[PDB]
Write a protein that binds this ligand. Structure first.
Ligand code: CHL
Ligand code: CLA
Ligand code: CLA
Ligand code: CLA
Ligand code: CLA
Ligand code: CLA
Ligand code: CLA
Ligand code: CLA
Ligand code: CLA
Ligand SMILES: CC1=C[C@H](O)CC(C)(C)[C@H]1/C=C/C(C)=C/C=C/C(C)=C/C=C\C=C(C)\C=C/C=C(C)\C=C\C1=C(C)C[C@H](O)CC1(C)C
Lengths: 214, 222, 39, 193, 81, 219
């Protein structure tokens, strides 16, 4: 069949290859129930898209900071620097705004998961077709896909779905690496990459001092 | 139905035809029909009380902000009226108890038996005032002197009454909570919010988010 | 996963989860608001 | 058919029955027929009072005719300010209950109460009476009225807002805009706070 | 604040717990295997019923006035006297 | 059909009906029909706007060589700027909604609203807009779209050359012609693993904020 995560091992039987990024990986059989599997598919998509946006917003400012053009703080310090620089914007007001905005959009996504296409009735400002949804985790329409890259052809949509899920998983793993590298070095990730590029046989996890506490 | 309070949810069938209905009953309080009738009356009575109260607070406050009148603020108007009141406090309470016992028993009797306060011999000759309309919470008669319930905009006026009533109920509770949290009047609260919305809100009044329950407030600050 | 969630729905597992939640809630209330005698 | 936005869809309840019907209802305000009839009468009433108001504001020698219109109430008359308010309320109450009773039941208030021989002619519209209200037989003219009424409504709103922000008379505002239009308009004046 | 307000708070929570338990038991009584829901908990149903227990005094008072809160004495087993 | 990559394959959704169609759509941005029509209108208006802009910047560099086109709004012939913005917004709003409702309802915006325009193609007005045609229709359409795409590329070059040099386009061309080996972007910007040389942008940070476009990601 398709390529699997562990060659020579049969894929998990509840995974049939229809979902994007199906390499048959479910050794704990967490997706045995199909409805729970759809829920976990939406979980994976939300996690991967959030990870991709966050990894972009860490990497590109850190690359620009490393060049010396700007002085954007590292990702683990940015909240502190923002609060120190914004005394007329309290933390709780920002948190309240974020919670109500994400609550609105996430409750709309949740209610579409419970009842697919039920946000298409025109209750939110007359929007009907753009909130119907194409598939589970893939809204589409003229608002979420204004360039129409999902409505061109089927194979193009499957290609872009594969690109999305693989880059999302890579960005999730990269954010895990960001956390681990900051805990081990106390620096940013582009600082880590530059230190490794300057002297790679000396700049390794084995010489940061915490991965090997000997 | 006027709409859906939560788009995509299943709205209860017993709220399909009520005026001002958005299918909002997650606690299923109105699933029983007798309870639903009682709660329709209760919501209308609360709506009309809050409507009149928010008028009697906001319009004096608006005219005070415009420099027209200088009536006392709502949370202190009880003190200033009582000193100049010819009737003392205890007599005022006793009179209010008597008058509201009478009128609320008449309203209650009409709720239990519709049209029964308008029957012949019910009141002392004046029973034609209180014939009712056969509609729960819409008495008419003296209470509709201009006869506008007989016009064609009656159904839209019922919807207007309920939505304005709910807004007024929320507004009065906001008046009380804002006074308890800030110690200033409602127009001053609005002007303070308009001067700096980011910094002048409930997150900075020192009461709505208690400091012990929210330790990040004393930490994530300049 | 269906059989596993059925096991997690057995009475002692539900009791463990619910009482862990209730005890944790009481403990954290008393940590954040120490020594409450009166309202 | 003339429309406010040529090339767009027109609402299905506005088919040119009414004068000034250009399909302009973006918010879909008057949809039920009772609402549309009431808003028709209200547009006529507001437009006619705004035509009178725009005329009486633009028309204003004399110490009284040199005062601002928004400070006109402070001029001294033969009566205190309370007395004229209630007299105007009484006269308006009589003529308004007459007009309202015509609006509810058409043709109900067409007869002089003290002269049984003097009666307005039948077939009277609610917002378009006849008889002594049309001493000349002047009655295409409804489009003209509704257009001048709408322009006067916008003009009176402009008077109100211009006297509120700049604090100036309408002629002063026009002369300020005619001095240099590129700097004395709604931009720049409000941007200078 | 010493006893009276705690009395109101306790009675509210206790009526919540009792009403949620009663609602779950009544809902389980109509199942094909009613005893199965008593030791294998229908957790989504239990969470839904637990959320609805906030409005318990209204529903319980209505059941009291309607006559559906109590089973009739002719339907309850008793020992010989 | 001539293709952007000869010996390759054009995408299926690009049949060749549109002018200047060489089967260039690797992202599939025009694979929807209504999106293809909207993007055709957008490419037309972008092409004409950049065409006028490239011509105007070249003339301004030739005519007034003392004025930087980037800072040409400082030297324009103090509160009167707000009124000119109002006039521009009003006129642009009117003509743009005329064009947009020509797109939405073809032929509806084909009559003078004061005192008429012939039946035409969407995005190709004709009438008074086309008094003289020295050529054919498809040929001149191809020339228009080709010159327009060249002008769009040229305007991107003008902007980024102004950022990296602080000078006008023809001055930059003269600097390239003086020293062709030491004036290219390859000559001044180098990134290798471990070391990056990023040229500075001579345009100041603010005057009104005036950021250099993604200067932190420059090579
Ligand atoms: C909705 C009714 C209502 C509310 C919310 C208030 C609120 C207030 N009043 Mg007023 N009053 C109210 C009604 C009346 N007051 C007064 C006479 C005064 C005086 C003379 C003074 C106040 C002052 C005050 C403030 C002092 C705080 C306080 O003592 O808590 C009271 C809290 C309440 C919630 C009000 C009383 C409880 C309840 C709302 C009464 C009504 C409930 C129904 C009768 C229940 C009936 C049951 C049915 C089913 C049979 C406070 C803002 C004073 C203050 O500001 O000091 C400077 C002040 O000096 N009030 C009278 C005349 C008898 C009222 C008649 O209804
Ligand atoms: C998951 C997405 C995500 C999150 C949570 C953040 C979070 C943050 N970013 Mg980052 N960013 C992202 C994606 C994200 N970014 C991407 C994809 C890029 C590219 C960037 C590029 C970027 C830069 C260059 C900077 C930040 C900064 C910040 C901080 C301030 C945010 C702010 O002021 O709002 C801005 C809010 C507005 C502009 C208004 C909202 C707009 C509506 C319409 C009104 C905050 C910690 C700043 C920082 O590090 O410290 C202050 C900073 O300099 N971001
Ligand atoms: C590798 C990145 C990537 C890829 C290939 C896709 C692919 C897809 N997305 Mg997804 N997405 C992403 C990241 C991505 N997404 C992120 C970060 C978010 C959160 C903002 C989303 C949120 C999202 C929604 C809400 C929807 C999609 C939809 C789609 C589909 C059509 C749109 C498209 O083809 O974009 C193609 C992507 C590219 C050509 C790559 C663009 C890379 C940019 C230019 C880099 C920008 C960097 C900058 C700093 C930020 C397709 C399956 C729609 C749907 O699922 O269809 C039915 C839909 O409704 N996406
Ligand atoms: C829920 C209805 C409600 C209640 C409980 C009150 C309560 C009160 N009002 Mg308000 N009022 C209301 C509705 C109400 N008003 C409405 C709808 C308006 C129109 C906007 C007003 C306009 C108003 C004014 C203008 C004044 C009051 C005043 C008062 C106070 C003295 C009343 C008095 O002496 O009785 C007299 C009993 C009669 C039957 C007359 C008292 C606190 C007075 C005050 O603020 O201090 C003395 C005062 O001057 N009220
Ligand atoms: C299920 C019960 C429960 C509840 C409602 C909470 C609630 C809370 N915990 Mg707590 N916690 C629990 C069980 C619980 N915890 C258990 C079993 C442990 C391990 C012994 C912890 C260990 C823990 C730590 C280490 C911290 C919290 C913190 C917090 C707070 C923010 C999250 C919040 C008050 C955080 C805090 O105190 O506030 C920021 C924090 O640092 N919790
Ligand atoms: C019927 C017996 C009884 C009663 C009425 C109380 C009452 C109280 N106990 Mg004692 N206690 C008991 C038995 C009892 N306890 C037993 C058997 C033990 C041994 C396990 C204890 C050991 C004990 C300790 C060690 C402490 C208490 C404390 C308390 C207080 C908790 C208040 C609180 O958490 O508010 C919070 C309010 C809520 C949680 C309400 C829920 C609101 C939801 C979230 C809405 C309260 C006065 C604490 C206190 O400080 O004493 C004064 C304290 O430190 N109790
Ligand atoms: C649905 C739960 C429920 C309800 C509504 C009641 C109600 C009643 N009980 Mg019964 N009880 C229960 C569960 C319940 N009990 C359980 C699980 C036991 C075994 C421990 C008992 C053992 C018991 C005895 C020995 C007595 C009562 C008595 C009573 C009566 C007086 C109140 C009282 O004494 O509380 C006291 C209650 C307890 C001591 C046990 C309560 C245990 C928890 C708190 C309740 C169960 C919650 C349940 C698991 C929630 C699941 C719901 C969820 C799945 C949605 C009243 C009829 C008394 C009497 O008959 O009065 C006339 C009496 O003498 N109960
Ligand atoms: C996209 C069209 C466009 C835009 C937005 C501008 C914008 C501008 N131009 Mg060019 N320009 C254009 C195309 C354009 N130009 C074309 C097609 C020509 C040739 C006819 C010119 C020839 C030109 C000259 C010769 C000059 C300008 C100048 C100006 C500035 C003031 C214009 C003025 O005061 O006119 C009021 C009438 C302003 C920044 C002047 C300047 O101050 O900046 C260099 C200036 O001297 N323009
Ligand atoms: C040099 C670039 C170039 C070329 C080859 C064309 C070519 C064309 N134009 Mg464009 N056009 C341009 C730049 C160009 N245009 C610019 C800068 C603008 C904005 C001012 C326009 C705005 C425009 C409109 C509004 C119309 C055309 C029309 C036409 C067509 C007939 C008129 C003609 O023969 O013009 C010859 C041009 C030169 C000799 C130079 C033809 C396809 C007409 C049409 O689309 O179909 C009839 C028409 O109505 N053009
Ligand atoms: C079980 C369950 C079921 C479902 O679920 C629901 C629910 C609710 C939960 C439940 C039900 C129930 C029952 C019905 C109850 C009733 C009863 C009796 C009859 C009473 C009497 C009878 C009762 C009476 C005598 C009583 C009481 C009296 C006394 C004096 C009191 C006192 C006081 C109080 C005030 C409080 C404070 O602090 C103190 C004191 C001093 C202590």
């Amino acid at each position: 069949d398709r390529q699997v995560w562990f060659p020579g091992n049969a894929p998990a039987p509840h995974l049939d290859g229809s979902l994007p990024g199906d390499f048959g990986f479910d050794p704990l059989s967490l997706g045995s129930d199909p409805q729970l599997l759809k829920w976990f598919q939406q979980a994976e998509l939300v996690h991967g898209r959030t990870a991709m946006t966050a990894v972009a917003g860490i990497l590109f400012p850190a690359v620009a900071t490393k060049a010396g053009v700007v002085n954007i703080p590292q990702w683990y310090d940015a909240g502190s620097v923002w609060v120190q620089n914004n005394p007329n914007f309290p933390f709780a007001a920002l948190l309240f705004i974020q919670i109500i905005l994400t609550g609105w959009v996430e409750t709309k996504r949740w209610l579409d998961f419970k009842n697919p296409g039920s946000q298409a009735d025109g209750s939110f400002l007359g929007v009907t077709d753009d909130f119907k949804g194409v598939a589970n985790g893939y809204p589409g329409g003229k608002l979420f896909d204004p360039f129409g890259l999902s409505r061109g052809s089927e194979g193009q949509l499957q290609k872009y779905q594969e690109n999305e899920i693989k880059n999302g998983r890579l960005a999730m793993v990269a954010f895990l690496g960001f956390i681990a590298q900051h805990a081990a070095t106390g620096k940013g990730p582009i600082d880590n990459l530059a230190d490794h590029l300057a002297n790679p046989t000396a700049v390794t996890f084995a010489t940061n001092g915490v991965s090997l506490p000997f | 139905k006027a709409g859906n309070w939560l788009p995509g949810s299943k709205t209860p069938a017993y709220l399909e035809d009520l005026p001002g209905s958005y299918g909002f009953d997650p606690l299923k309080l109105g699933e029983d029909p007798a309870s639903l009738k009682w709660y329709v009356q209760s919501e209308l009575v609360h709506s009309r009380f809050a409507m009149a109260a928010v008028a009697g607070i906001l319009i004096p406050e608006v005219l005070k902000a415009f420099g027209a009148v200088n009536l006392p603020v709502w949370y202190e108007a009880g003190k200033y009226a009582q000193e100049s009141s010819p009737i003392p406090f205890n007599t005022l309470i006793a009179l209010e108890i008597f008058a509201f016992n009478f009128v609320e028993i008449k309203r209650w009797q009409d709720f239990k038996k519709p049209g029964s306060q308008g029957e012949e011999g019910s009141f002392v000759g004046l029973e034609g005032f209180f014939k009712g309309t056969g509609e729960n919470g819409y008495p008419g008669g003296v209470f509709d002197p201009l006869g506008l319930s007989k016009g064609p905009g009656y159904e839209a006026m019922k919807l207007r009454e309920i939505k304005n009533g709910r807004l007024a109920m929320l507004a009065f509770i906001g008046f009380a909570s804002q006074y308890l949290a800030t110690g200033k009047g409602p127009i001053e609260n609005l002007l303070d919010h308009l001067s700096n919305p980011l910094a002048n809100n409930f997150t900075t009044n020192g009461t709505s988010l208690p400091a012990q329950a929210h330790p990040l407030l004393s930490v994530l600050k300049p | 996963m269906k059989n596993f969630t059925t096991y997690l729905s057995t009475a002692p597992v539900v009791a463990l989860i619910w009482f862990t939640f209730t005890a944790g809630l009481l403990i954290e209330i008393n940590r954040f608001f120490p020594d409450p005698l009166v309202f | 058919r003339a429309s406010w936005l040529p090339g767009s869809e027109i609402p299905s309840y506005l088919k040119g029955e009414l004068p000034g019907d250009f399909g302009f209802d973006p918010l879909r305000l008057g949809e039920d027929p009772a609402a549309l009839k009431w808003y028709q009468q209200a547009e006529l009433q507001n437009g006619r009072w705004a035509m009178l108001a725009a005329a009486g504001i633009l028309f204003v020698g004399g110490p009284a005719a040199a005062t601002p219109w928004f400070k006109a109430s402070d001029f001294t008359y033969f009566a205190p300010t309370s007395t004229l308010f209630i007299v105007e309320l009484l006269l308006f109450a009589w003529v308004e209950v007459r007009r309202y009773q015509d609006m509810v039941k058409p043709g109900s208030t067409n007869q002089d109460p003290i002269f049984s021989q003097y009666s307005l002619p039948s077939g009277n519209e609610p917002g378009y009476p006849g008889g002594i209200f049309d001493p000349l037989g002047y009655s295409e003219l409804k489009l003209k009225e509704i257009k001048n009424a709408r322009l006067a409504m916008l003009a009176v709103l402009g008077f109100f807002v211009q006297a509120k922000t700049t604090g100036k008379t309408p002629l002063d505002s026009l002369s300020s805009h005619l001095a240099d239009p590129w700097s004395n308009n709604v931009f720049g004046i409000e941007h200078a706070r | 604040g010493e006893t009276l307000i705690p009395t109101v708070g306790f009675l509210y929570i206790a009526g919540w717990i009792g009403t949620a338990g009663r609602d779950y038991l009544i809902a389980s009584k109509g199942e094909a295997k009613p005893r199965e829901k008593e030791y294998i908990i229908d957790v989504p149903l239990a969470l839904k019923i637990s959320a609805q227990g906030a409005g318990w005094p209204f529903r319980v008072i209505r059941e009291l006035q309607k006559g559906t809160l109590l089973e009739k004495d002719s339907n309850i087993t008793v020992s010989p006297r | 059909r001539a293709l952007w990559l000869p010996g390759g394959d054009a995408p299926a959704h690009l049949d060749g009906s549109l002018p200047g169609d060489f089967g260039f759509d690797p992202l599939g941005l025009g694979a929807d029909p209504e999106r293809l029509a909207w993007f055709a209108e957008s490419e037309r208006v972008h092409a004409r706007w950049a065409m006028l802009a490239v011509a105007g910047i070249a003339v301004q560099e030739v005519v007034r060589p003392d004025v930087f086109w980037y800072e040409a709004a400082l030297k324009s012939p103090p509160a009167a700027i707000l009124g000119l913005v109002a006039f521009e917004l009003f006129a642009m709003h009117f003509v743009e909604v005329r064009r947009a409702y020509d797109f939405k309802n073809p032929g509806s915006q084909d009559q003078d609203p004061i005192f008429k325009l012939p039946k035409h193609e969407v995005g190709y007005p004709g009438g008074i807009f086309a008094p003289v045609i020295p050529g054919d229709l498809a040929e001149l359409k191809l020339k228009e779209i080709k010159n327009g795409r060249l002008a769009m590329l040229a305007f991107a070059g003008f902007v980024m050359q102004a950022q990296v040099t602080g000078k006008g386009p023809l001055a930059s061309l003269g600097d390239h012609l003086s020293n062709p080996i030491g004036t290219t972007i390859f000559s001044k910007a180098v990134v290798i693993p471990g070391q990056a040389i990023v040229p500075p942008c001579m345009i100041p940070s603010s005057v009104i904020p005036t950021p250099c476009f993604l200067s932190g990601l420059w090579p």
